[PDB]
RNA sequence: UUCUGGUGUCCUAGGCGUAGAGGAACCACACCAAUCCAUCCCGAACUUGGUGGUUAAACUCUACUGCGGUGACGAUACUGUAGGGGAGGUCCUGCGGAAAAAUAGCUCGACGCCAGG
RNA sequence: AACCCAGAGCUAGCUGGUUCUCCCCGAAAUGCGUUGAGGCGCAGCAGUUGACUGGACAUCUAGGGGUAAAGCACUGUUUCGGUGCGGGCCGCGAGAGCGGUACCAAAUCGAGGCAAACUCUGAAUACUAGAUAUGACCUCCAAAUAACAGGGGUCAAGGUCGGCCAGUGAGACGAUGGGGGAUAAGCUUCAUCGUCGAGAGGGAAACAGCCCGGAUCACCAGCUAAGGCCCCUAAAUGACCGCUCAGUGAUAAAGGAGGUAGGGGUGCAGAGACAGCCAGGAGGUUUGCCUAGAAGCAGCCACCCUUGAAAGAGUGCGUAAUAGCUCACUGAUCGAGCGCUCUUGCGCCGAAGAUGAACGGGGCUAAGCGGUCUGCCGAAGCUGUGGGAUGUAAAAAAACAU
RNA sequence: GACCAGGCCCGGGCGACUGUUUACCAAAAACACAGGUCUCCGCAAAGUCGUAAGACCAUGUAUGGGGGCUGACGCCUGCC
RNA sequence: CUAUAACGGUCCUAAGGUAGCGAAAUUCCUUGUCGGGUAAGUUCCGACCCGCACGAAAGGCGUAACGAUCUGGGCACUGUCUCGGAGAGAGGCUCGGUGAAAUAGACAUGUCUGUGAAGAUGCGGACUACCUGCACCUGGACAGAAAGACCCUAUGAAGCU
RNA sequence: CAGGUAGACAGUUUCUAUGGGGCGUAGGCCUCCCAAAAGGUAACGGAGGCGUGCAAAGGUUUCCUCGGGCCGGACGGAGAUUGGCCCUCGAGUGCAAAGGCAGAAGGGAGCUUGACUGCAAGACCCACCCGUCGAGCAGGGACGAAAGUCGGCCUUAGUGAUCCGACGGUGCCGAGUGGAAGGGCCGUCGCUCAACGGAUAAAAGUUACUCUAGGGAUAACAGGCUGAUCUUCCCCAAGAGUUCACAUCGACGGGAAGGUUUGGCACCUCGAUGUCGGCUCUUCGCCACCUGGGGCUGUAGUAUGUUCCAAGGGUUGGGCUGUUCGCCCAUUAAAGCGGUACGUGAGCUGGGUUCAGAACGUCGUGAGACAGUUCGGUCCAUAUCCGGUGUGGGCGUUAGAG
């Protein structure tokens, strides 16, 4: 959602790169949501997907939110554009590159996790798929 | 919306003729066998 | 309303790299703190800069886990010279000042 | 001519730990007293002068990869040039260079001087 | 704050303008400073005259780094599990010894992630230097002809320090590396490079910056680069493999799809595999709670066994509830392929603007899109044949570079 | 009977009013005004123009002469 | 009972606005709310006072008469209008005389669409147009004027404080 | 002659980067990042400090290791002072950060004044000015027994050129000569000259009464790029709808198109592209208000709700306001939204880029001012060409005609 302490208030951007070879594996959970598409995912889509698959499981099992934002995005107001004064308490952002696991789920059967992970992939600006723990 | 139209010199890096066929880049000019050198263009006759 | 634009412009760095001819009094390293400790045939400065004492090359070698040791060696090397373009340059200077 | 022990220098830095050994000689602790000296108090430290026993502590030697340090090859990311795709974020080719991490290993240092017996 | 005359041809860091020719060379839009920002002084980069010089371009080697990548060893930050310093209440009638606890939290371990102001690491390039290496041409030459090498001659090119003497100091786009923005702008600011500026020609329909390419001049000469070969408009209605049926062929996505051409997996069949018709789909049973009824069909809890060829406390409809229609499953007739997933290639929809085909045009199912094979067209490039000028150079001729 | 020759009423704002004002885009709510108040001035006055002589004031003498503000008239004009 | 403040304390000043007025030539929110007028009224009038930011000679509140003053409403009246129509003159049109002007690089001076210094008769593709007058209309020629009064720059000028 | 003293009067100043402004902010020095692994490098990019302080916190000799957790000790507890182990550089360095520094550059003790004079080979930085380091020599010393070390501080910030003036001192000049007045030279002092390369020792505002030289380098109106904002549509479905995601809405989110609002850039135009509303008169788009056809409906019929095709045609009269928009009345099949530079002022008229006069509130000491209000306030024009509507004349239509 949002980090409590910030070492630095405002932080500039950074560009996407190739396939994340570290966060591609499955640590916990049986099923996952691997992203094929490098972009930003705010904490707002993470709340949307989290409510989506928690209320789409709704009887048993547990999900695993992998990513945390850890960088802010400063939106300048409509004040005729010259400075980056204050935009730090505005929306946070997680960098996602291809390969990276976004969500995981366990305790759920086959097609209930297919609709749980697949319906909650519609709350997201980047194309994904669901991955079994091989 | 949020899709930028490609203006001038960005239109030229996109819509220029590019021969993107790996065969037609390999083509060199044709080679005929060499011929003996032609004689003199003219000659003094006295 | 910005609280910025406080640049500094100050410069430092390695002045003479390794395997290079030094001079007596030539400033080898300008550094902040001691990235390069003074070895032999060198001297440390008032603001920890490393200058050479004698002529010769400079070298770098460890004496701990990280340290670097700028040193100076006397360099009695290389008498032979197979250079032949330069003699053609001076010889053509002679031929052009004798031709005209 | 090995050990012993003052001394260094290159060092992949060679250490922790578990084990075995050494008091002929050497090194080191221990007991007694304080005159130079000394601790913001103590001869704990330092100094002087002796009983002089031990390896107990400390040093030295030999093993182990249990930690530690070091660390591959192949790959692969990246990147220089020459290009291509995408609406963008950005990706893919030819040639050259080439990681890091991890892993297989390597490492319980190596060369010199001088005085004994 | 009148008008005329005079200072006065005031002053203007501002605007406009500044007139004949030929040849050689040729920028810059950067930094610093400025009562300065559209000015100026200096440096950078020109021209010319020198004096020292011997370098440039390729290849190799050596040095410092801390960028990209990477990583959690420091600084933070963060997801989860366990032991969890410590608290939360029931609590006892008290100076109190320690009892009650599936609940929250410092610390560590494990599995993990992220960071321009984090680094145990660490490239490629770049910078400094060292080192290796004749750049073309003509001619002689070993009894000599080839060739190797050599002798001689000619040309071309780098830099430093000056003298005199200018402009320039508004840049623009394209690739990469980033910051500001909303990783929006033909946006703004930087760093390396290419072009324009100051660059003509060809391709791009037209069109500064995109690709080829560097225009001394002539020819009613030839060969090519980029790009093209149906017609407008030069050259192939060329050849052989596949694909597209949307005129896609100019276009934008999420997502949907028995589109079509494949490719990889997995499951059933000559002891009959798929699709349709027909037969069965029952007993305890209306499992136990509720309701008037809940009989599978408003719902709650599990969600049986038996006959068997198979039947599910039911897949849906329906009824006041039943009854009942029907299906998952099995039996029977003909019979030989049928599923269900990933995946590309080209396609479809998504895809809608205001004057009128508007996407070069006509049009084409190839004249479209991918993979090769041979030729041609195609510039002011190159070559050839001839002039001119500049530099060597100091007379002419000749040569090489321009 | 042609030409000629008042349209009016009901409310409100401002200015009391008749007048004056930007010749050539503003006639007004602007200026002035009668009235009020403060303040200066004893004549060799104050004030104004002029280096000066001097002049207006004024051949007038505080019931008069300047200057500031407000604007008839009616009620008043508070505190510091 | 909901309120609201007769009343109270405190801080700071030199003093904390008196009478009267009050969404006003003053009120941003605001077309405040109510009542009148109107079929319907951001304008008008009468009120409340939450006076952004009235107020007592930079006077405040009133009023008869007055005003080419502003503004609200009503009667009569009519081409203002619905929704135009006819007629008379001076022009305009034609002929004869006289006869300019602003403007003007040369003009063999189409439409769409696209491109381009981002609004093209002039460049590209297509379509459409025999040449050339006369009478009307003015959409374009970024039409004419006139070195933008607005904006900014000038180490400009000037007035005023 | 001297003091005081009125913008009554005179000459002047009143910065710049910027958002091209009231309302702000900054101007000079240092550290990290941006900064793309040499150095450099910009933005009103992200974070901080500095305008000093120390008689030791300088010099030298010598000694020592901190910091944190645990355990012990009726004051004293979690934590003071003391003892012991563990981790070994995480502490500290006058203060911001960076790089350093573990038998230290960190802490203590002794003696101390090199926090000297005269210098200085060579380097770095380099527009210039500057600024930084320095072996080595002489004098005279400090510490140490000596070796050696010391020309301030672990380093980088803690500052300011010049002209002039002042103090201390001197074997210098002394306008005929001897002096003196005065001036040098040396050592230092005096600027928040902080707009910090400093204009002068000394300087604020307004102009709507304005004026000139310029600029599209630079705003407004309009066009262009962008699409944050707005309009429209679509993907998923937790729900609401007696049951029931998808008759109808659809939360949390996501993907597009358009260029009609407000914005961003400043690319054409200021030697002139005339904004807002109304009248007249077009034409065009569909994101459909009605008319025509249809699907679905929680559609019994009437009337619907939503949606598909379809832009041929229509889309009223009025009270308020300058009004666009909007409210209200009477209705109507319905009283659509927009493009065409307000679509349209070389066709026409009011509020306004609120022009010159005046008044109210408020601000200002004042001149004056308000994206506050009110009253009054000149708007030109004979069509050259294209374009249009009408109407001819010539020629052509292959002999000439009706």
Swiss-Prot record, chain A:
Q: Where in the cell is it found?
A: Plastid, Chloroplast
Superkingdom is Eukaryota
| Record-linked InterPro entries | Ribosomal_uL16, Ribosomal_uL16_bact-type, Ribosomal_uL16_CS, Ribosomal_uL16_dom, Ribosomal_uL16_sf
Q: Cross-referenced SUPFAM superfamilies, in alphabetical order?
A: Ribosomal protein L16p/L10e
Keyword annotations for this protein, in alphabetical order, are: Chloroplast, Methylation, Plastid, Ribonucleoprotein, Ribosomal protein
Q: Which Gene3D superfamilies match?
A: Ribosomal protein L10e/L16
Give the CC-aspect GO terms. chloroplast; mitochondrial large ribosomal subunit
HAMAP family the record matches = Ribosomal_uL16
Subunit description: Component of the chloroplast large ribosomal subunit (LSU). Mature 70S chloroplast ribosomes of higher plants consist of a small (30S) and a large (50S) subunit. The 30S small subunit contains 1 molecule of ribosomal RNA (16S rRNA) and 24 different proteins. The 50S large subunit contains 3 rRNA molecules (23S, 5S and 4.5S rRNA) and 33 different proteins.
Sorted alphabetically, which PANTHER family does this protein's record hold? Answer: 50S/60S RIBOSOMAL PROTEIN L16, LARGE RIBOSOMAL SUBUNIT PROTEIN UL16M
Q: Which family does it belong to?
A: Belongs to the universal ribosomal protein uL16 family.
> What is the purpose of this protein?
Component of the chloroplast ribosome (chloro-ribosome), a dedicated translation machinery responsible for the synthesis of chloroplast genome-encoded proteins, including proteins of the transcription and translation machinery and components of the photosynthetic apparatus.
UniProt name for this protein: Large ribosomal subunit protein uL16c
Which organism's genome codes for this protein? Spinacia oleracea
Lineage of the organism = Eukaryota, Viridiplantae, Streptophyta, Embryophyta, Tracheophyta
- The gene is rpl16
UniProtKB/Swiss-Prot annotation, chain B:
A Gene Ontology biological process noted in the UniProt record is: translation
Q: Name one GO molecular function term.
A: rRNA binding
Mention any one GO cellular component term assigned to this protein in its UniProt record: ribonucleoprotein complex
Which keywords accompany this UniProt record? Answer: Chloroplast, Plastid, Ribonucleoprotein, Ribosomal protein, RNA-binding, Transit peptide
Give compartment(s): Plastid, Chloroplast
What function does this protein fulfil? Component of the chloroplast ribosome (chloro-ribosome), a dedicated translation machinery responsible for the synthesis of chloroplast genome-encoded proteins, including proteins of the transcription and translation machinery and components of the photosynthetic apparatus.
What family does the entry list?
A: Belongs to the chloroplast-specific ribosomal protein cL38 family.
The protein's assembly and partners? Component of the chloroplast large ribosomal subunit (LSU). Mature 70S chloroplast ribosomes of higher plants consist of a small (30S) and a large (50S) subunit. The 30S small subunit contains 1 molecule of ribosomal RNA (16S rRNA) and 24 different proteins. The 50S large subunit contains 3 rRNA molecules (23S, 5S and 4.5S rRNA) and 33 different proteins.
The protein's name in its UniProt record: Large ribosomal subunit protein cL38
Query: Which organism was this protein described from?
Result: Spinacia oleracea (Spinach)
What gene does the UniProt entry assign to this protein? Answer: PSRP6
Query: Span within the entire protein?
Result: 48 to 93 of 116
Swiss-Prot record, chain C:
Superkingdom, according to UniProt?
A: Eukaryota
Q: Where does it localize? A: Plastid, Chloroplast
GO annotations of cellular component type: chloroplast; ribonucleoprotein complex; ribosome
* Keywords assigned: Chloroplast, Plastid, Ribonucleoprotein, Ribosomal protein, Transit peptide
- A single GO BP annotation from the record? translation
Coiled coil (residue ranges): none
Q: Name one GO molecular function term.
A: structural constituent of ribosome
Quick check: keyword Isomerase in the entry? no
For this chain, the family text in UniProt reads:
Belongs to the bacterial ribosomal protein bL27 family.
Q: How does it assemble?
A: Component of the chloroplast large ribosomal subunit (LSU). Mature 70S chloroplast ribosomes of higher plants consist of a small (30S) and a large (50S) subunit. The 30S small subunit contains 1 molecule of ribosomal RNA (16S rRNA) and 24 different proteins. The 50S large subunit contains 3 rRNA molecules (23S, 5S and 4.5S rRNA) and 33 different proteins.
Functional note = Component of the chloroplast ribosome (chloro-ribosome), a dedicated translation machinery responsible for the synthesis of chloroplast genome-encoded proteins, including proteins of the transcription and translation machinery and components of the photosynthetic apparatus.
What name goes with this protein?
Large ribosomal subunit protein bL27c
Q: Which organism is it from?
A: Spinacia oleracea (Spinach)
| Gene symbol of the encoding locus | RPL27
Full-protein positions shown? 66 to 165 of 194
């Amino acid at each position: 959602l949002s980090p409590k302490r910030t070492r630095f208030r405002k932080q500039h951007r950074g560009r996407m790169k190739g396939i994340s070879y570290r966060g591609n594996r499955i640590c916990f959970g049986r099923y996952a949501l691997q992203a094929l598409e490098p972009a930003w995912i705010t904490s707002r889509q993470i709340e949307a997907g989290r409510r989506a698959m928690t209320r789409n499981a709704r009887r048993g099992g547990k999900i695993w939110v992998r990513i945390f934002p850890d960088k802010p995005v400063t939106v300048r107001p409509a004040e005729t554009r010259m400075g980056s004064g204050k935009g730090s308490p505005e929306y946070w952002v997680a960098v996602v590159k291809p390969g990276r696991i976004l969500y995981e789920i366990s305790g759920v059967a086959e097609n209930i996790a297919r609709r749980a992970v697949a319906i909650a992939a519609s709350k997201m600006p980047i194309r994904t798929q669901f991955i079994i723990s091989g | 919306s949020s899709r930028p139209q490609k203006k001038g010199t960005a239109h030229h890096m996109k819509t220029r003729p590019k021969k993107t066929a790996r065969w037609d880049i390999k083509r060199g000019p044709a080679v005929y066998p060499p011929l003996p050198p032609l004689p003199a263009e003219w000659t003094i006759v006295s | 309303t910005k609280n910025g634009r406080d640049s500094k412009g100050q410069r430092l760095g390695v002045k003479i790299y390794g395997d290079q001819v030094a001079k007596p009094g030539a400033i080898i390293i300008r550094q902040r703190g001691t990235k390069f400790h003074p070895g032999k045939n060198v001297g440390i400065g008032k603001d920890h800069t490393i200058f050479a004492l004698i002529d010769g090359l400079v070298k770098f070698e460890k004496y701990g886990p990280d340290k670097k040791k700028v040193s100076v060696y006397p360099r009695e090397i290389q008498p032979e010279n197979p250079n032949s373009y330069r003699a053609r340059k001076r010889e053509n200077f002679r031929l052009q000042r004798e031709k005209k």
